[PDB]
Ligand SMILES: CCCCCCCCCCCCOC[C@H]1O[C@H](O[C@H]2O[C@H](CO)[C@@H](O)[C@H](O)[C@H]2O)[C@H](O)[C@@H](O)[C@@H]1O
Ligand SMILES: CCCCCCCCCCCCOC[C@H]1O[C@H](O[C@H]2O[C@H](CO)[C@@H](O)[C@H](O)[C@H]2O)[C@H](O)[C@@H](O)[C@@H]1O
Ligand SMILES: CCCCCCCCCCCCOC[C@H]1O[C@H](O[C@H]2O[C@H](CO)[C@@H](O)[C@H](O)[C@H]2O)[C@H](O)[C@@H](O)[C@@H]1O
Ligand SMILES: CCCCCCCCCCCCOC[C@H]1O[C@H](O[C@H]2O[C@H](CO)[C@@H](O)[C@H](O)[C@H]2O)[C@H](O)[C@@H](O)[C@@H]1O
Ligand SMILES: CCCCCCCCCCCCOC[C@H]1O[C@H](O[C@H]2O[C@H](CO)[C@@H](O)[C@H](O)[C@H]2O)[C@H](O)[C@@H](O)[C@@H]1O
Ligand SMILES: CC1(C)CCC(NC(=O)c2cc3c(F)cc(F)cc3[nH]2)CC1
């Protein structure tokens with residue numbers, strides 16, 4: 001159950017109101033770009049955890065009661081100049097005055113600065129550890145004002161340009177906020193790299209697909225408008241829910257490629273239609289009714305592959321899904337609205353500026369036809385070989401290693417952890433809230449301490465079990481509610497956290513006390529647990545929805561399951577290569593990244609994206625061969641028809657997407673490189689190994705079993721437009737005796753009854769013709785009978801005329817119907833007067849024949865019908881009548897009015 005009257009109406013309307021469409025939509029997209037440029041100041045960095053988890057609740061309660069830990073905010077390593085020591089009093093005074101000046105300039109942003117450098121004369125052992133033994137290095141802590149991570153990072157970015165100058169520039173800034181600033185600036189770095197690299201390369205690839213300036217420029221303008229509008233839409237979404245930083249490059253990584261590919265396909269189809277003889281109006285309408293439907297289906301598939309990411313609670317994945325959906329649907333809309341109207345405005349002008357203005361698949365698919373096993377199993381084994389590294393993939397959180405190993409901030413952090421060990425901690429926290437509301441006594445604290453000392457593997461520095469699990473510090477941003485007490489202690493081995501947490505949560509709390517196990521390891525592990533808990537349902541929804549959409553698009557049952565297994569193998573192989581590249585470290589030396597576990601939500605993101613890519617390409621390809629089997633073509637060449645019709649467009653689209661993805665593989669963010677490399681691997685696997693080799697071979701393996709659909713999941717074959725409806729359009733269908741423009745009695749489709757003025761003589765003739773007492777009224781089927789009689793009489797008259805018989809025997813059924821139309825209108829004597837025109841048609845020179853027919857006085861006197869018939873001659877389709885200028889007014893009886 002499909003619907004194309006909607007697409008036909010829109011193809012008509014976008015040509016009818018093309019200027020309004022182009023103006024309104026371009027204005028909306030440009031205003032959206034102007035409104036969404038400011039998205040960079042409204043994105044967030046949170047959303048990596050499960051915010052409905054116990055670790056997040058523990059973190060929130062600890063923040064409320066004790067205050068958030070601002071000690072890891074800013075760390076500053078200071079080194080005296082000229083091999084001096086940190087004990088030089090003049091240098092001490094200088095640096096201290098500099099730091100005081102920096103803090104009092106930004107009291108709105110900095111809380112203060114805390115170190116050993118502030119109180120050199122002290123005995124506190126922890127403070128005296130902020131200096132190295134050599135007295136060549138000393139680090140300080142600079143807490144910042146703020147209430148959420150984004151405001152704190154903004155305050156740090158406000159204070160950094162002046163804080164960096166301290167100590168003659170020889171101050172090294174590490175901590176949470178410097179790393180955050182670098183990791184977020186990676187996004188803008190990638191944006192600028194894309195602007196510089198992909199735009200001219202995409203221009204070149206387009207200009208090589210279309211040997212024309214305009215036909216190659218249109219998809220680029222479409223992609224630009226799509227990026228602008230999608231950024232505006234994400235800026236609007238930022239008003240309701242937090243949008244993550246990583247959602248910005250997605251718009252440029254995924255949105256731009258699909259938008260330009262949509263534009264490429266639509267412009268190519270418009271050029272096909274124009275080169276097939278249709279004028280601009282019919283070209284736009286058919287371009288819609290075919291390629292726009294394909295594009296909308298593509299967008300629906302991408303949305304169906306993205307939506308399941310809304311199951312995971314990580315707002316990171318949610319904002320990414322929002323960005324994907326917005327970009328893709330806006331690209332589809334622009335492709336069937338700005339681009340359609342722009343083509344309707346330009347016309348054949350889209351080929352005006354050639355190359356000078358700037359200054360075979362069938363053979364290869366037949367190579368796979370002879371021996372399918374020679375390419376199928378030797379490729380399936382290679383893919384299941386690439387799958388085995390996928391098994392040994394690990395997951396982890398965000399560290400300094402997400403930056404390249406030569407990044408100054410990562411090296412500053414690693415030098416801090418070398419010079420000052422024991423300050424960077426990941427302690428697990430037991431948070432105790434008393435449900436009743438009264439203070440917590442030391443007895444309950446001791447009970448919890450003992451029940452925690454039950455568990456092993458926790459750090460015991462000075463070897464005193466009654467000093468482990470010390471109390472969390474408390475600063476001024478905490479309520480200090482006596483009903484909440486937090487103990488905490490680090491882990492000897494981090495890889496045991498997921499177990500120890502599961503132990504610390506099995507401990508029985510004191511009576512009337514609620515226990516929450518939190519901390520950075522607990523946050524990470526609970527996030528990963530939510531991810532793995534919700535993954536199978538996501539995969540099931542993905543596969544089921546995509547397979548149902550393939551049930552809709554294919555009209556088959558074998559092909560959806562086949563393409564599902566194909567996409568599964570492609571996803572597995574791509575993720576195996578990704579594990580081999582980023583976990584096992586292969587390719588790291590050339591790309592300059594550190595091998596490490598992947599970000600957990602990136603696994604679901606990459607699953608969704610790669611599955612959508614594979615399914616989209618498989619659908620767009622296989623539909624073209626289902627087209628041929630619907631026409632009646634044989635299997636072994638229906639495959640060839642589809643593959644050869646898709647080759648150039650598929651390769652160009654894959655090339656543009658590969659350009660845009662390789663523009664991002666050079667990122668300084670290991671997650672960005674992971675995503676872009678996975679996209680590149682999946683894309684180059686689908687554009688070559690999947691489409692060229694495995695698809696035709698594995699399909700031929702099933703031969704004529706691939707299109708088998710049971711019952712009637714398959715659409716019904718349409719009512720084939722015939723000569724009856726054509727001449728009903730041109731001559732009218734009247735079921736009651738009427739007078740023509742000459743004043744004679746006509747009925748049916750231009751069937752002259754008699755040239756007598758008597759209505760009763762005409763009724764006598766009509767009753768004699770039909771065989772009953774009609775009273776001047778006939779049914780539609782009787783009109784069809786009379787019309788078929790007249791058509792047969794005209795055909796017999798044509799085969800009798802020696803000037804019309806050759807060209808009539810030369811033509812096809814549609815052009816033969818056009819010739820019969822001309823006969824019915826103007827007599828065989830009049831039709832034979834088009835000697836050279838009929839010669840052109842007989843020689844199948846449709847363009848010359850149409851141009852010459854449009855110069856008769858037949859066109860001057862009956863221009864609409866003549867234009868319709870001449871279009872039928874030029875194209876050979878009923879398209880000039882399936883969507884025609886409605887409403888005729890003057891009915892005239894035709895020649896060969898058959899009596900009996
Ligand atoms: C574009 C991609 C780039 C990715 C950038 C990543 C930059 C790294 C910055 C990491 C800042 C971690 O700060 C440490 C903070 O951890 C928790 O706070 C958490 O409390 C919330 C309650 O919801 C939790 O949900 C939040 O995870 C968190 O605010 C502690 O409670 C705070 O005491 C401590 O200060
Ligand atoms: C990606 C993350 C990598 C970066 C991680 C680096 C973590 C940075 C931790 C550095 C801790 C700096 O402060 C540590 C010291 O200060 C506090 O005590 C004192 O501070 C007051 C200052 O006025 C004194 O007056 C009070 O005697 C007393 O409360 C802490 O309680 C102690 O532990 C320690 O002595
Ligand atoms: C405001 C929100 C409103 C709800 C969302 C917007 C409306 C969604 C309308 C439904 C989706 C329209 O697409 C669904 C498409 O499925 C098939 O596609 C195929 O049609 C091409 C014709 O040539 C073939 O070539 C290809 O094999 C293949 O694309 C069917 O033939 C049609 O049913 C329809 O074209
Ligand atoms: C600057 C422009 C960069 C262009 C961007 C696109 C480049 C994509 C590259 C992805 C391929 C990953 O390749 C990684 C492999 O390459 C090298 O193999 C090492 O072992 C082999 C046998 O001993 C020898 O072939 C090498 O000599 C030896 O280096 C690496 O060392 C290995 O970890 C890993 O095997
Ligand atoms: C067969 C045809 C295939 C097409 C050829 C593929 C393109 C290969 C030729 C162009 C490669 C030139 O790369 C230029 C790159 O310079 C920089 O590199 C710096 O960042 C990376 C990690 O730190 C490391 O590359 C370096 O260590 C570091 O200098 C930046 O990354 C970008 O400004 C830019 O992207
Ligand atoms: C002619 C075409 C209609 C063929 C499919 C072409 N489809 C893509 O190029 C494509 C990109 C893409 C992506 F980045 C993510 C994702 F989940 C799915 C994706 N499909 C468009 C042009």
Ligand SMILES: NC(=O)CN(CC(=O)O)CC(=O)O
Nearest residue numbers: 833834835836837852853856
């Ligand atoms: N265009 C036609 O119908 C053929 N005509 C028109 C023409 O001179 O080209 C020639 C002829 O009838 O002799």
Ligand SMILES: NC(=O)CN(CC(=O)O)CC(=O)O
Nearest residue numbers: 862863864865866888889890
């Ligand atoms: N639309 C009309 O009634 C006039 N004509 C159509 C035309 O002008 O081409 C009808 C016909 O001649 O069959």
